[PDB]
């Protein structure tokens, strides 16, 4: 039942509500030390786009509004830009931890 899981994933993505604020999935991650290091390694255009998206979301939440439905972040164009940087940061931190174990 792959398409049932996929359509349920689309439903959960629409029901989470951050697509109505223009946000991506990687903007909603909590900025811990690994996530902050992932933002620090970003290229500057992606960093500026992310900062504008957070500012727009905070401005929309201030007025208790949402974007119009055509401006919502669609599921197919939601790019997981922070995944390789976060993956590298987790790999390096686990390597440091396993070196500190021995």
């Amino acid at each position: 039942s792959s398409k049932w899981l996929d359509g349920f994933r689309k439903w959960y993505y629409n029901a989470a509500g951050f697509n109505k604020l223009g946000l991506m999935r990687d903007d909603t991650l909590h900025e811990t030390e690994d996530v902050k290091e992932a933002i620090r390694r970003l290229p500057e255009d992606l960093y500026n786009d992310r900062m504008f998206r957070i500012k727009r979301a905070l401005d929309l939440t201030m007025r208790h509004q949402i974007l119009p439905k055509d401006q919502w972040t669609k599921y197919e164009e939601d790019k997981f830009y922070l995944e390789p940087y976060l993956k590298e940061v987790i790999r390096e931190r686990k390597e440091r931890e396993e070196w500190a174990k021995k």
Partner: protein, 420 residues
């Protein structure tokens, strides 16, 4: 037990030299013909950052893994760079030399060159330049090479201040892919057998063409530069063209350099056998030092006078040294002093190769310059074949040649090139 020096050239031009002396600690260096002379004006200072970028993440080992593995076993890693070529040397125990070879070859062959790493490394670039420019000899030599050549040797070792914060990792990848090619590198090993060197050479090194970019022949320029920076001592270097490496006049220029004086032999001596120091101290009474500066490259060369004098006594010291060299050029010299200069040059060459690191550096330099190993006795007998007329001819070529001057200090009394 060191039965010979195993010297081999692979068909792609990569040179492997190995000597098995059964030393307690092995030393393995990769010598790449990728010095500071291979940059044009669009990527100046890239060799400085590529020298400092040895501890970055590579395809096969992270920077944390590289550092903790290179110093967990007690080993060491260094990069030695001149204008012509660079050397990546690893050194450690015979038991742990295999992982050191893997770390060295991961550093040299496949660097990743991430953007945040070089962004964090530009600060260390500025700090290293400011530390290395604490000696005024460094600034004088940099300015002397800047004035002496139009291109392809006037590029500095250290990154210029405008280039800091503007060197990208794409230029580093461009430099690596254009200058770290197969027929410009020699892998030299001491305390390690030849077969593992050949296995590492066929494993880690055989994905490069061999030629890359050639160069721009290092045309001569001439002229002078004067830096009023207010120092207690005035440093002046007056240089002219000389022989390149491999000519019959380079050995004569070295013999002339040791005849005029190229360093002290006694701690707190007076340099009685140095002609330049005796000629200057004949009329002077203040602290000073005069030596003969010599440098030989693949296509060009530099020979001249280096003087450290007082602010108000620079002209007398410079004129005394120049008159001494002009007297040497007119045949006014003793053959016994030429014999003493030959003995000094032979002693200095033999003392430069007694240590393992100097031996490795000389083997790598010879393998890059000529592609074959030269035993030291052949070098000594090549020194012995220098005639006195060759020394007179070298001095005459220095006197009659066009000059490049680099001066620094209080230059109110320092003379000019046309006033000599």
């Amino acid at each position: 037990q060191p039965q010979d020096l195993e010297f081999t050239k692979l068909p792609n031009g990569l040179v492997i030299a190995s000597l098995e002396n059964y030393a307690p600690l092995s030393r393995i260096g990769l010598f790449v013909k990728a010095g500071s002379r291979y940059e044009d004006s669009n990527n100046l200072g890239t060799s400085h950052l590529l020298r400092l970028a040895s501890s970055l993440t590579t395809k096969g080992a992270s920077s944390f893994k590289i550092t903790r593995g290179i110093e967990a076993v007690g080993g060491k890693l260094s990069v030695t760079a001149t204008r012509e070529n660079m050397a990546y040397t690893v050194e450690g125990i015979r038991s742990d030399i295999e992982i050191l070879m893997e770390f060295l070859l991961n550093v040299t062959t496949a660097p990743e060159f991430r953007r945040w790493e070089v962004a964090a490394l530009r600060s260390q670039l500025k700090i290293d330049k400011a530390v290395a420019f604490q000696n005024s000899q460094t600034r004088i030599i940099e300015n002397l090479h800047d004035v002496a050549y139009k291109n392809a040797l006037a590029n500095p070792l250290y990154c210029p201040d405008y280039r800091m914060g503007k060197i990208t990792s794409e230029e580093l990848h461009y430099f690596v892919q254009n200058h770290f090619t197969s027929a410009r590198m020699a892998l030299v090993g001491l305390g390690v057998s030849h077969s593992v060197l050949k296995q590492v050479a066929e494993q880690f090194l055989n994905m490069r063409g061999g030629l890359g970019l050639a160069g721009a022949k290092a045309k001569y320029r001439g002229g002078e530069i004067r830096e009023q920076n207010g120092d207690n001592l005035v440093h002046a270097a007056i240089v002219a063209e000389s022989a390149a490496i491999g000519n019959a006049e380079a050995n004569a220029f070295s013999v002339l350099q040791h005849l005029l004086g190229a360093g002290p032999h006694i701690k707190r001596g007076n340099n009685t056998t140095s002609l330049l120091s005796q000629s200057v101290a004949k009329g002077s009474h203040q602290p000073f030092d005069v030596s003969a500066f010599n440098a030989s490259y693949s296509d060009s060369g530099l020979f001249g006078i280096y003087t450290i004098s007082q602010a108000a006594a620079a002209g007398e010291v410079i004129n005394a040294a120049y008159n001494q060299v002009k007297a040497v050029a007119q045949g006014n010299l003793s053959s016994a002093d030429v014999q003493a200069a030959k003995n000094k040059l032979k002693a200095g060459y033999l003392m430069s190769v007694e240590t393992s690191e100097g031996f490795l550096s000389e083997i790598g330099s010879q393998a890059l310059a000529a592609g074959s190993y030269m035993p030291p006795s052949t070098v000594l007998q090549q020194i012995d074949s220098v005639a006195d007329a060759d020394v007179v001819k070298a001095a005459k070529k220095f006197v009659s040649g066009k000059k490049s001057m680099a001066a620094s200090g209080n230059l109110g009394h320092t003379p000019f090139l046309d006033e000599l």
